[model samples]
Target: MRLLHTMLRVGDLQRSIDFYTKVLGMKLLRTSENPEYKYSLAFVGYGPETEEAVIELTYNWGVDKYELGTAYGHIALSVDNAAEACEKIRQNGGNVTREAGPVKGGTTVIAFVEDPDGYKIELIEEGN
Candidate 1:
């Protein structure tokens, strides 16, 4: 089966959106909200939804925070240069957790960044 998107509930919608869009350079694809639903959805991605999977942020009104249980998992992305990506992330106010060093696990370099609500995002450079 194809994966269309990965969804994560966020405390602050705009903050998460900005992180994915501005920090990561993903485009704000679309959004959704309903009076009765009490929650809003925001989608950001690097490409078309038709072929590429995207990140989905959900914001439930009146929720100032969320509990990240063990069930929650982190996301990973491929970068040409993990250090450069870490630098860029730092420039954009993204939290970098320095994991620099070479890796032989098929991924040449490894780095990491955490999102606003303590969501871990892994940066991998699987160079050829």
Candidate 2:
């Protein structure tokens, strides 16, 4: 079976949406609000859900933060140039945690950036 989507519980829906859309250049595929459950869900990604895996942002009423446990590692994205991508992210008011460069043990270029909720995203150079 193919993978679906990765879910992330975010404190502020709009802020997270802005980060994923405005900063990372992803599209808001869709959104749903569950009034009875007091929560909302937003799906964002580079392409349609039918073809590509996406990210699910869940915003629960009254919740303002989350302590990201150590078990969750960073999500990775493929970029034409990791260094250029990081620079773009920085110019867009995003946080670049690690500068783009060769991997520690390999030659693959990579960089790390953080979202508003402190979620780490790894950028790997394409055609590695």
Candidate 3:
């Protein structure tokens, strides 16, 4: 089966939206609020969900934090230039935990950045 989307529980929906859209250059695909469930969801991605996978940000009312357990690793995205991508993220008030460079024990370039809620996102250079 094809991959659908990755879901992340965000403390602040708007902050996450801004980071994904403004910093990572993703589009806010759609949003839905479930008043009965006391939660909301925001989908963001480079294209429509029908063509590619996307991220689902869920905000549960009255919950503003998460533990970010150790079992979870990080989401990865391909980029044309890891260094430039990191720079752009930094310029947009995003956190660059690992500067762009060759990955350990490999020649492929990669970088790491964190979202507002401390979720790590890995950027992999697609071209040399």
Candidate 4:
């Protein structure tokens, strides 16, 4: 079986959407509002949902913040150039937590960035 999507609870849905779309270059797959639950869900990805795993952003009405517990790690994405990716992310107002370089004890190039909700995302250079 293939993986479906990773879900994150965002404090600001529109801001998060802008970051994912304009900064990270993802497309908004769809959005739905659960009136009874008072929440909305927006799915986004680099391509069509049917072809690639996507991210699900859950926005609970009236909730504007979250505590990113220490237990959760980061999501990873592959890139052709980690340094270039980090630069682009920075230029687009994204937070660059780590500069691109050789992985600490590994040879593969890598870097890290943070989303508006404080979720970490890793960029591993392609070709390892």
Candidate 5:
């Protein structure tokens, strides 16, 4: 079976949405609020859910932050140019943890950026 979506619990839904849409250039697919569950879900991705996997942001009522465990790792995205992507992210007021360069012990070019809640997203240079 094909993979679906990755779910992330966000403290601020609007902030997370801005990061994904304004910073990372993902499109918002849909949103639904569940009053009974006291949470809302927003689906986003580069393209339609029918063709690509998506990210689901869950904003629970009254939660303003999260403690990301050490086991968590950064999400990765492939781009034609890691350096350019990092530059754009920086221009958009995003945090770039790693400058564009060869990954340690490897030749694959990569860079890393952080989201509003400090979740890391890696940008791998395509065709490397």
Candidate 6:
């Protein structure tokens, strides 16, 4: 089976949704809440979940912060132009930790950015 989705704990639900949707140009797919669990979830992606994996954002009631564990790796996405993607993300108020450029000993280009909750993302141009 193919990969499904990855969930991230976020402090602000709307804020996370806005970043993935507005800045990254992903769609707000769906959302749900559990009163008993005191948590809410929102899914965003470039396409439908069945067609491609998506990101799940969770907001736990009464919790406003979470320290990212070191076991996690950054999520990556393919882009037509890594540099242009980074530029758009920055113009939309996203944090660009690495400017887009070719990697060492390769024609492939890549860039890095961080989300509102400090989650890292990589934009890759796989033209090699």
Give TM-scores for every candidate, taking all chains together and pairing residue i with residue i.
0.86, 0.90, 0.91, 0.88, 0.88, 0.90
Candidate 2: give its CA RMSD in angstroms. Answer: 2.3
Off by over 4 Å in 6: none
lDDT of 3: 0.93
Assess candidate 1 and give its TM-score to the true structure.
0.86
TM-score of 6: 0.90
Name the top TM-score candidate: 3
TM-score of 2: 0.90
Candidate 1 Cα outliers beyond 4 Å, as residue runs:
104-107
lDDT of 5 by residue, 1-128 (tens): 78888898998998889878877778889999999999999998998999889999999999989989998897888767888878888887578999999999999999999888888899898695
- Per-residue CA lDDT of model 6 for 12-113, tens digit only, reads 999899989877878999999999999999999999999899999999998889989899989998877888878878877578999998977988999999
Over 4 Å off, model 4: none
On lDDT, the leading prediction is 3
Candidates' C-alpha lDDT: 0.84, 0.90, 0.93, 0.88, 0.88, 0.90
Error of 3 at 57 (Å): 0.4
List candidate 5 stretches off by more than 4 Å.
91-93, 105-107
What tens digits encode model 4's per-residue C-alpha lDDT throughout 9-111?
9999998898888777778889999999999999988888777899999999999998899988988987777887788888775789999999889899999
Candidate 2 lDDT tens digits, 64-110: 89999999998898877788778778887578999999999999999
Report the C-alpha displacement of residue 63, candidate 2, in angstroms.
1.4
Output the better candidate (3/4) by lDDT: 3
